[PDB]
């Protein structure tokens, strides 16, 4: 990157011969089960024209993958985490601005391969033409939602998942006989409906054991501001889907309803640029 | 590179024993949704024969992928980002020149594989000849548009995309029955036209959540110039295509029109070589 | 990571120009066979706003894979480690909090590949459409169980295993003739039941020779706390399953019962923040 | 390399405890569209027996890929860059010599794979023998033209290119019906000839957006020379081919004519070894 | 690892600003052919709460692969190393404890790939379903036998081996006609039995030329112990199997008997913590 | 390597706290077209028991790939570089000895893969057995010719090359109809013989644009020698083959004659150990 | 390795703050063609309890691949290097011991892949079961022969080689018609027998151009020994096989005889521990 322009590596980076005052702030939201942690760092270079503060948004958002209700032996439900989110808003009153962020959106790729085979038999001359196309498919996608001057947020959505080494299924799949078989343990099962869901160990880890963010947003403030103090709000949330499965007198049929419940955990932090410390 | 010519690594690089004065300038263009950020750095070596200034053109250009209009239940439209651009012009009056830039155009590659198989049967001797050819295909292509002494620009164009694990489609594809099926959720669908488009999560990330540049241009100025001050214009823009789909009484047909709307966000920055700071 | 935001590498890390007081505490639980070791480290930065203590939870939990009982020459049993666990609780009375942890849950991935081949014969034109999907399957899965403010734990569960280069079997597999053949040496064997189990060398190493953790939890304490002293409990445990196999007068049939025995080894450690040492 | 002869790494390299005087010289040739840049560096070791000067020949040679003329709706032309060149001559009068250069010619490689399969059928015993051979094919080849004492040059030639995921075509390909279909958008097209060429985005990047060199030549001069001053000429150039396509009343036929136009941009730089600076 | 918790790399490691007193102790056991070497190191940190001593158990255990006896031209034997072992016991009287060890047990992995291809013929519609599963198989497995407070040991067992590019054979393989053909040079051979064994070069290297360990165990002692002196025993051993092959008047039949001979080489070393040296 | 024997990396290397006197000597042989360059370095350690001098034999040997003569429209010839050589002789009178050299001969490798597939049909049980074997084949091979005390040399020979994505032809290939088709553009061509050779761009780069060595030989001299002065001869050379092709009234036939012309460029350099400089 | 036990990297290594006295000793054995070179190094740590001396056994053993005799036009011979060896003996009188050595024996690996495919036809249900197994095969194997207290040696043996892209042949292969065809240029050839051998360029490099060792043995001596002086013998050797081929009036038949000639080059070096130098 920088070395390709004949500039020495690390020349244009910042933070040299200066003292960062790091920190840590841990919260637990027992109502929603969101361990929260806001590691920060106040980088003050005399060369840089603005102060800096990198906010690491570590933590954990618990999956909460469980059978929420059952109605007899022919109907049951399941609530699973459809998407995890982490937002970092900043009041429009304040004059500090978000400078950068990481991770960011990346461009996909796919391999395309084509064939052309023709042979002869001892005359049955044949010709064969074919093309194949391959690409990788993560179970969960870390999308950086579009940022602005005061707001930046991420989300992790549910791409698709392979159910007992059989089919990549997604929230939109539909099969006329069996319905959406995303978390259906057995098709022609004879057990109670409440006990015919995929074992959470068999599923992805993020579904039941939760997703632990690692995100960064550096915010810069003018060095001659009238007041050196800005509050910030950071919001965690998860969106859960209702997966119902019931018996049609011949086989199980499963249906999925998108974005059934969403629970937000919001915390407000006050930043003190002069003291170089921000508090709960 | 440098070590292959028996020269010690880093000998010919610049920026040693000198003080770069970095900086940062953040703007948000709420009309067009273009977060903008112009991290810069003034590298002054006494060995180098000209002053330097590397301009990092970070930011984010929001995707803006949405159904702009609907006309009944048999016609609808879609505006999607065909190409993102970043230009960095310099007035022809000024005597500063762009020195380098990164990234730059790179040479493609493809693998070619050939076969020759002949067998016998217990006599039906056969012969088979075939050749295969494979290469990777990014969804978006980062082309460095041809630079000049005062102007350098990049663009990120739409190569092609795989629609529900079925076919790489591009802006030019055409199928006599269905038309261009780039973002067509269902072929023989029975839903409202406005609700028959590919879900933005299913698409590429850059389409809906935006593209965040990371580009660099070092500009050099003569050290004995009469006036040590030059203004610069940096332009962001995105080009949107209109994707229309309608019902032909039997199946959906979709058409794509290229370069329908383009919105430019231009900002002018004044550079002060003597003070080593450039302002909004 | 940090270098992508133009910050110099290692700027925002902690532990510079400070003296960590490391340590070590080894215990052996001969009743359950759990070698235990709690390497710790007291990192005190004057810049950081809280004290730190990283707790490495190394050790070893022995596999204990053996034939626990035999009942004649037509019935026998096997106890094998279904899952190893490591928990690190903290009394809710104390004001120290767990800050971070490693390893953490990671997002899976799978490759999807599609084909489309059509040929001609000398006319028998054919068409072939196919898709393949591949992914890796570890024998044991290291899941980070959902953490909280005072409690963090991991577990290592049994995914599946390939029995004599023949089939990946798991705890839930069932075959109507042979039953669950997870550890069945021979199908139509004629030996004693006690001597018809898979040789422990042929199995995975973790089944018989044990699993040695390597986990980390940093806990932070407020620097102006009223009392600088907190005790901690760390718990190891393994969960064993009963694998029974018997003769049906024609072939062996094997059945597996989940979570038969669980044995916990709990130890309490007292931390002294002022002295920077924690004792057994 | 050097470490394999038991010599410490970097022992035999040069440039230690010395001061290189780097530089930069930017030119733009608006007639031919060749951004030009001659980053240099004067490495003077007291241990080395000759002075050094590494000349980096960065820049950009614009592709110039456009329809130069059209003659009705049944005939048109296209001029595309067949080869980019960069030469660095030195007058035979001068006593400075080119010492090294980079990149240099490299030896190709190919994988050879052989098969021998024989089977039986329930007796139709068969035998199958086959061999496959694979290798990579860059679109453009960077050949170091043979250097001499006073002259060194590179060139980047057109290997071949895949046209709409169909066939690797080169300048020499010929098909009796369609002719050379290197840049033919459609075979049985019905559009104007001027609008039946491959879209420049679909082509390689180097064709339309240009090629940016990165080459190095260190030249050494005797330290006791009578005059410490030598001028140098550096030449850029591109070679364009005329691609004509016309209608044969049934389908398009395309023909390519090699080395139609070549445009050279020559600049002369005067080197001053005593002052350690070279000027435009 | 450590850098992921925002701690600077190497902060929590030990051995800074201290003087380790290394050493070396070489023994040769000509009766059993076991070159033995116990490189050690006394790491004394004033920060660490216990003294350290890392014991490297290098050496070599000769394979001893030879025809031990022959009984005519129709019967012969072979003794080959079934498993090499290295144990490091510590008397239960002493108060020093083994702290860590390396290498340790690792979790296996396997790739699972599934297919689903259906085509049509010009109607003979077919469907094809298949799954493949691949994994690597070392010839010898380095198992860490379960350690305790006073005892830690490793072993290297014989997984399986490919006999003349034909079949992966193991100690348990059986073929009703030929028996266990693990080291059988020819099936329908006509040579003397003593000369019908696989050439030791064709086999694995570890069988005939021996296995050289590289293992480490750090043992820690309380710093205020009453007596600073502990003796240690380190045991090498190899287990040899008897592979017999004889003529059945039509073809060779070979049988393998497990764990026939085991030879142990035990040495006792006295550690002097105060002097920081341990002797033979 | 060195770190595996518990010795610190770089401990046993040489060249510490000493001053190497490097240099450079460039020659051009316009008669044979061999750019020549003899970068050297005088490493004098007071610990080492002998002086050192590493001789880098860089340069370039031009390919000289051209049609040397033509005899009508039915016969022509071609001279191409069969092998490049670089020798570094030392008079047997002198007492300096060559110490090491790089590159050196390396051991090849090949992958062997075997199959065993048997299926059933609905009974036509079949069995299939096959084995495949693959390895890479460089176009030119860099063989270190066997060195001695006073003479060391390398050579680069012509392995084989793929002619227009068709067949790996070599110098020894023969086809009864067409002869050796190594550089035959067209089989049933109708052009002049002089214009029926493979285009030099289509061939390997080393054939026409030349091969640039990078070789090293350290020579050591006794420190108490009677005379501290030795001359050295370094020889470049290329061997050219005559490739003739002529018309047999039906198709072209090509023949290759091995080692037709060889041209040597020899230079003598005088080394002065006391002054630490060697001259042309 | 060392960093996994929480010890800082390089803590337990040796050679810090000490002065190694390296050296070099070159010999050429013109009778056997064995360039010999014994780079050494005397590492004296005050922490280490014994002196050290690492002996690098570089050099070159010429291949000597030539037709030794011919008997008419129907019989000829070939002597080729079957195995190269390097031994480093130490008199049993001396009290110095070999401490370590490198390289050492390594454990092989192989990939096992299994398939299970069953399809249906439009009913001809079929089932297919197959397994494949792959591994790499070096041409020459570097086996560390079993070391002892006073003697350590290596050898490089001939694994197998592919003859004109046709079959991997070894010294033991036999074909009833053609015999061992290891170096047989043509089967139904009509040339003189002396000119029907594989061209040495077509063979492996080690056969004709020689094998250059790179081996290390550190020997340690007690620091309070009565006499600080030990002599050492280092032996090179190569073993040559006689490959005869003759005409059977229909086709060539070739036979190989193992270990025909062996030539040893022995040199004795006297080590002076007090002076830290060893002489020829
Ligand atoms: C020979 C191929 C082979 O072992 O196949 C392994 C499995 C086949 O599925 P299974 O029928 O589970 O394994 C039976 C294989 N056996 C014949 C050795 C009993 O292959 C897979 O499951 C994949
Ligand atoms: C569809 C398969 C495909 O992309 O084939 C590419 C070529 C096939 O040989 P070509 O005749 O070169 O391509 C024409 C085939 N196509 C126009 C239908 C695309 O494949 C190669 O040339 C290799």
UniProtKB/Swiss-Prot annotation, chains A, B, C, D, E, F, G:
Which Gene Ontology biological process is one annotated for this entry? cytolysis in another organism
For this UniProt record, give its keywords in alphabetical order, as a comma-separated list.
Answer: Cytolysis, Hemolysis, Secreted, Signal, Toxin, Virulence
Chief location:
secreted
Sorted alphabetically, the Gene Ontology cellular component annotations on this record are:
extracellular region
* Keyword Signal part of the UniProt annotation: yes
**Effect after changing residue 131 to L:** 16% of normal hemolytic activity
Q: Where in the cell is it found?
A: Secreted
- Per its UniProt record, what InterPro entries does this chain match? Aerolysin/haemolysin_CS (IPR005831), Bi-component_toxin_staph (IPR003963), Leukocidin/Hemolysin_toxin (IPR016183), Leukocidin/porin_MspA_sf (IPR036435)
Q: Name one GO molecular function term.
A: identical protein binding
Q: Which domain of life is it from?
A: Bacteria
Per the entry, what this protein does is: Alpha-toxin binds to the membrane of eukaryotic cells (particularly red blood cells, RBC) forming pores, resulting in hemolysis, with the release of low-molecular weight molecules leading to eventual osmotic RBC lysis. Human RBCs bind much less alpha-toxin than do rabbit RBCs. Heptamer oligomerization and pore formation is required for lytic activity.
Family, similarity comment: Belongs to the aerolysin family.
Subunit notes for this chain?
Self-assembles to first form a non-lytic oligomeric intermediate, and then, a mushroom-shaped homoheptamer structure of 100 Angstroms in length and up to 100 Angstroms in diameter. Interacts with human ADAM10; this interaction is required for toxin pore formation, disruption of focal adhesions, and hly-mediated cytotoxicity.
Q: What is known of its domains?
A: The mushroom-shaped heptamer is composed of a cap domain (comprising 7 beta sandwiches and the amino latches of each protomer), 7 rim regions whose protruding strands may interact with the membrane bilayer, and the stem domain (52 Angstroms in length, 26 Angstroms in diameter) which forms the transmembrane pore.
> What's the protein name?
Alpha-hemolysin
List the source organism: Staphylococcus aureus
What is the name of the gene encoding this protein? hly
């Amino acid at each position: 990157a920088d070395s390709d322009i004949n500039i020495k590596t690390g020349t244009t980076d910042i933070g040299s011969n200066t003292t960062v005052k790091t920190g840590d702030l841990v919260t637990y939201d027992k109502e929603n089960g969101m361990h929260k942690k806001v590691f920060y760092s106040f980088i003050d270079d005399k060369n840089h024209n603005k102060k800096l503060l990198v906010i690491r948004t570590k933590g954990t958002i618990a999956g909460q993958y469980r059978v929420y209700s059952e109605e007899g032996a022919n109907k049951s439900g399941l609530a699973w985490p459809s998407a995890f989110k982490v937002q970092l808003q900043l009041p429009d009153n304040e004059v500090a601005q978000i400078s950068d962020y990481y991770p960011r959106n990346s461009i996909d790729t796919k391999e395309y391969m084509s064939t052309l085979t023709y042979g002869f038999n001892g005359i049955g001359a044949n010709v064969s033409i074919g093309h194949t196309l391959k690409y990788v498919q993560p179970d969960f996608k870390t999308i950086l939602e579009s940022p602005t001057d005061k707001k930046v947020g991420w989300k992790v959505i549910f791409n698709n998942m392979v159910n007992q080494n059989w089919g990549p299924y997604d929230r939109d799949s539909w099969n006329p006989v069996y319905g959406n078989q995303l978390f259906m343990k057995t098709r022609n099962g004879s057990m109670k409906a409440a006990d015919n869901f995929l074992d959470p160990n068999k599923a992805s880890s993020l579904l039941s054991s939760g997703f632990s963010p690692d995100f960064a947003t550096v915010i810069t403030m003018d060095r001659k501001a009238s007041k050196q103090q800005t509050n910030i709000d950071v919001i965690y949330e998860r969106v859960r889907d209702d997966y119902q499965l019931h018996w049609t007198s011949t086989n199980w049929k499963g249906t999925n309803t998108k974005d059934k419940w969403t629970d937000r955990s919001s915390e407000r932090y006050k930043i003190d640029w002069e003291k170089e410390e921000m508090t709960n």
